Amino acid sequence: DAAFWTAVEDGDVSALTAALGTDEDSVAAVLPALSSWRRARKERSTVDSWRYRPTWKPVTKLPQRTLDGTWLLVSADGVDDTDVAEALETGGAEVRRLVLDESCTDRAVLRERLTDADGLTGIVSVLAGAERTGAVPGTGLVLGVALTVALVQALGDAGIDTPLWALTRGAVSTGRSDKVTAPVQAQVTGIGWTAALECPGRWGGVVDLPETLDARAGQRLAAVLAGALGDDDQIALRSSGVFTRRIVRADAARDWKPRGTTLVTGGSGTLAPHLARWLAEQGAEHLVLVSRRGPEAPGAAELRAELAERGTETTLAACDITDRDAVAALLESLKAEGRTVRTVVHTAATIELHTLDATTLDDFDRVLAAKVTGAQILDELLDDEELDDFVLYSSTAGMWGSGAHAAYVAGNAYLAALAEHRRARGLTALSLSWGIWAQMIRRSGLEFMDPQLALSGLKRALDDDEQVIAVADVDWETYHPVYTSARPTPLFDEVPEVQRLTA
């Protein structure tokens, strides 16, 4: 068999006409079409091993357990704690409220408030409630987001090794009819995931909270906070009970074709070229590539021409997607040609590394602002009528944590949520998590992907009206052990090849 297929895989051989004994003239009559059919099969089959979804697994049996000692409950602005204070009280603990203000975004200012606060038993932050937007210049950062990075920083500054937990509400979808209601808080989740990795000694976990925290949910939360679930840190809480998160392989409904005008942000970018070629191969009649540099960008003028030869008019535009009125200018402009944007693809991003201890608000802001303010602005303006697609580029760094990627994970998890939140209200949106496209890097367990195969991923996704998926080549037998080397986790236990390993 391997012999047989190898022979057809390469072609230009008679090892077959031997092994089969059918003349020879009727071999190369069939050979290419068979050689094709297995090129195709080989490529569907590999791609298949690249797709993954995050999913929520019910906890069948929640070990009964209560809280002990003292717990600091960290809020801000006008974030209500009561409902959560009550659960910790009735769950057996003594509660220290620590309210914060915008000036605490400063890690020095904040550490000054952690006096009379050692030998705590646990810490609990409901800073994700602080969704307010204009309260820390000159950043565009969300209040609670900043305070969160602050809080983590101050505690490592102060040397407080007591375990920290973050609570969101409305940032996860356990599925069913569990709408995402506050995509913003998924930023904190994002940091949470990452802090798990960076400072595993003092990170508890993160918990989405149900619309209403009743008594049972109270008790449940208290048990989770206590330590009930061991190493299981990503947790949702519903009135139906408790779920922990897993990453699963996707199971191996229509067609898809680029109509009207297609917008692509991050045009000056690295991946942008592959996508634009690809889209021109799908019959794209007009591509708008947007990017601050835009026209006068290092590959801009030649790929413009390369696409103009295949029949695709591609207008380069210079615009900053962080600019409500520039983008509004451009959008309203084309509508006056008049175009119709049927598809947006949002690759606008600046990937800068940075650790949580090191980073500053301004690094954090720099990384987020393009992806994020990008999407909200696109989300505000775009017509939402007729435009049948709205694809967001994302990363596994953001379907789960990565060391030193806190902001990018924060930004990427927001994309997914904003995607889930839009679908929730009946609007189209796909957040797709790549995946590294084509050595220091490659030993981490990640493998690089062919841009075309990788775009096969995206085709399938677009055909299937997905809302969030990953497309990535992972060698789990080296990835997993790297990943867990400090902190252990069940996040990947349901990935078959990761099971074999565990045994």
Ligand X SMILES: NC(=O)C1=CN([C@@H]2O[C@H](COP(=O)(O)OP(=O)(O)OC[C@H]3O[C@@H](n4cnc5c(N)ncnc54)[C@H](OP(=O)(O)O)[C@@H]3O)[C@@H](O)[C@H]2O)C=CC1
- Annotated binding residues, written as ranges, equal 268, 270-271, 291-293, 320-321, 347, 349, 371, 437
Which of the listed partners (a copy of itself, ligand X, none) does 41 bind, with a CB threshold of 5 to 8 Å by partner kind? a copy of itself
Q: How far is CA 134 from the centre of its chain?
A: 25
For residue 229, the SS3 value is coil
Q: Say which residue the tokens 């991946």 belong to.
A: 271
Q: Which of 155, 134, 129 is nearest to 144 (CA)?
A: 129
Quick one: tokens of 423?
């679908």
Residue 263: closest CA among 251, 254, 272, 252 = 272
Query: What is the x/- site pattern for ligand X, positions 225-264, by CB under 6 A?
Result: ----------------------------------------
CB 117 within 8 A of CB 94: no
Q: Could you tell me whether strands 341-346 and 261-265 are parallel, antiparallel, or unpaired per DSSP bridges?
A: parallel
Stretch that binds ligand X, among 169-177, 224-232, 341-349, 462-470 (CB under 6 A): 341-349
Binding-site member from 26, 270, 360, 485 for a copy of itself (CB under 8 A): 26
From the centroid of its chain, how far is CA 187? 10
Paired sense of beta strands 286-291 and 234-238, if any? unpaired
Annotated binding site for NADPH: 268, 270-271, 291-293, 320-321, 347, 349, 371, 437
Q: With CB cut-offs between 5 and 8 Å by kind, which of a copy of itself, ligand X, none does residue 293 bind?
A: ligand X
User: In sequence order, what DSSP letters do the residues of 453-503 get, joined into one string?
Assistant: HHHHHHHHHHHTT-SEEEE-EE-HHHHHHHHHSSS---TTTTSHHHHHHH-
Is 434 a binding residue for ligand X by CB under 6 A? The answer is yes
1 binds a copy of itself (CB under 8 A): yes
CA atoms of 314 and 286, how far apart (whole Å) = 6
Is residue 412 within 8 A of residue 397, CB to CB? The reply is: yes
Residue number with CB closer to a copy of itself (30 or 252): 30
Sole binder of ligand X in the list 141, 154, 180, 370 (CB under 6 A):
370
Q: Is 41 in the site for a copy of itself (CB under 8 A)?
A: yes
Q: CA of 421: how far to CAs of 129, 143, 376, 427, 432, in Å?
A: 17, 20, 12, 9, 15
Considering the complex, state which of residue 49 and residue 239 has its C-beta at the smaller distance from a copy of itself.
Answer: 49
* 343 in contact with ligand X (CB under 6 A): no
Structure-block tokens of residue 4: 């047989």
Residue 239-278 contact track with a copy of itself, rule CB under 8 A, x = bound: ----------------------------------------
Q: Which does 21 bind (CB under 5 to 8 A by kind): a copy of itself, ligand X, none?
A: a copy of itself
Quick one: which of 6, 14, 19, 481 contacts a copy of itself (CB under 8 A)?
A: 19
* Residue 321 in contact with ligand X, rule: CB under 6 A: yes
The torsion region of residue 488 among left (phi > 0), alpha (psi -120 to 50) and beta comes to: beta
124 binds, among a copy of itself, ligand X, none (CB under 5 to 8 A by kind): none
Q: Residue 133, interface with a copy of itself (CB under 8 A)?
A: no
- Among a copy of itself, ligand X, none, the one that 373 touches (CB under a kind-dependent 5 to 8 A) is none
Nearer to a copy of itself, 39 or 335 (CB): 39
H or E segment at 122?
strand 122-125
Inter-residue contact 105 to 142 (CB < 8 Å): no
d(CA 397, CA 413): 9
Question: Does 457 sit near ligand X (CB under 6 A)?
Answer: no
Residue ranges binding ligand X (CB under 6 A):
265-266, 268-272, 291-293, 297, 320-322, 347-351, 370, 393-395, 434-437
Q: Which residues bind a copy of itself (CB under 8 A)?
A: 1, 19-23, 26-27, 29-30, 32-34, 36-37, 41
